[PDB]
């Protein structure tokens, strides 16, 4: 876009929980436009969380969400045909975007046979602070704040 | 080996190279550093990275002699002045005063062809 600000689409909150984060999550799980299958996967996963872990899985999901939420990002810059991975602030929207994206890819990355168990294990572990998504977040953070000398490139 | 524990640092930051040297209050140097001792050769010696390195190299060979407090006096108009400054500032040392001491001519000797055409 060159003129507009590309207004953010307001997602319809989920039915059972009345929450928008759950809707966003199930949307991110989606492949080939199969909503029902993704919702079933999520519901099975949360039921597994409930059986295994005493408390309501809604809170554990949210806690994992702000657990795997970063603050710094490195972006490329093209000055004199050279790369400048300048660190930069992330808006809450962007924060949420990468958080959900990492969560879903990490869920798909597990070696467990079933998708539901994979996503459940990733969710619980990310809540704890271990797993692929978390390790990737500290990866990007340590990639950031290590080239603070480049901070003058405000961009 | 000197145990002066308090000296002054001099930074010659040129276009092509940056050299840092630590000395006693008297003015007898104890150690230096240069892009060259790091291992960089050619253009990259002038590049501030080599400054980021010889920066602390000074400091290290200085902790080696047990110096704590430092006075920083910088010379030249090199690209890697300020980053070298922040460097030997946070190399683990208490900097007292930092001053720019770039020596300018009082319209004396005629420079190179590259440095003429000044109006």
């Amino acid at each position: 876009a060159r003129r507009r600000r590309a207004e953010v689409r307001q997602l319809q909150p989920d039915l059972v929980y009345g929450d928008v984060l759950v809707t966003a999550f199930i949307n991110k799980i989606m492949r080939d436009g199969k909503k029902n299958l993704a919702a079933r996967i999520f519901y099975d996963a949360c039921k597994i969380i409930q059986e295994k872990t005493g408390q309501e899985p809604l809170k554990v999901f949210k806690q994992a969400v702000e657990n795997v939420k970063p603050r710094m990002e490195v972006r490329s810059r093209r000055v004199g045909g050279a790369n400048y991975q300048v660190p930069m602030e992330v808006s809450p929207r962007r924060q949420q975007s990468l958080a959900l994206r990492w969560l879903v890819q990490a869920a798909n990355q597990r070696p467990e046979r079933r998708a539901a168990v994979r996503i459940a294990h990733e969710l619980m572990d990310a809540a704890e602070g271990k797993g692929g998504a978390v390790k990737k977040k500290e990866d990007v953070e340590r990639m950031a704040e290590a080239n603070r000398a480049y901070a003058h490139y405000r961009w | 080996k000197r145990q002066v524990a308090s000296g002054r640092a001099y930074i010659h930051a040129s276009y092509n190279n940056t050299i840092v040297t630590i000395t006693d209050p008297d003015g007898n140097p104890i150690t230096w550093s240069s892009g060259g001792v790091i291992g960089y050769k050619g253009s990259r010696k002038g590049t501030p990275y080599a400054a980021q390195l010889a920066a602390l190299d000074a400091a290290k060979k200085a902790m080696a002699y047990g110096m704590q407090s430092v006075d920083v006096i910088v010379r030249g108009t090199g690209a890697g002045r300020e980053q070298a400054i922040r460097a030997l500032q946070a190399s683990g040392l208490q900097v007292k005063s930092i001053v720019d001491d770039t020596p300018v001519p009082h319209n004396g000797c005629r420079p190179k062809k590259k440095f003429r055409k000044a109006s």
Binding site: - | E82, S97, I98, D100
Partner: protein
């Protein structure tokens, strides 16, 4: 603010009254431009000469060292 306004009555040609002359010097031993000093053309010109005289006598610095970043 301009230096000239925030002063009292004084002499320009007096090359010995150091504590007024220094206030016409920067942190480095340089004569301020007309903008900073707010002096007329003739008084600036005579002030330059007085500065040079007192400066040769050793009362004023040829240069000073700015203490900053």
């Amino acid at each position: 603010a301009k230096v000239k306004a925030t002063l009292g009555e004084f002499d320009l040609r007096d090359y010995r009254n150091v504590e007024v002359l220094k206030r016409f010097l920067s942190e480095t031993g340089k004569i301020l431009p007309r903008r900073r000093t707010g002096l007329s053309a003739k008084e600036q010109r005579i002030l330059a000469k007085t500065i040079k005289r007192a400066r040769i006598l050793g009362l004023l610095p040829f240069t000073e060292k700015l203490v900053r970043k």
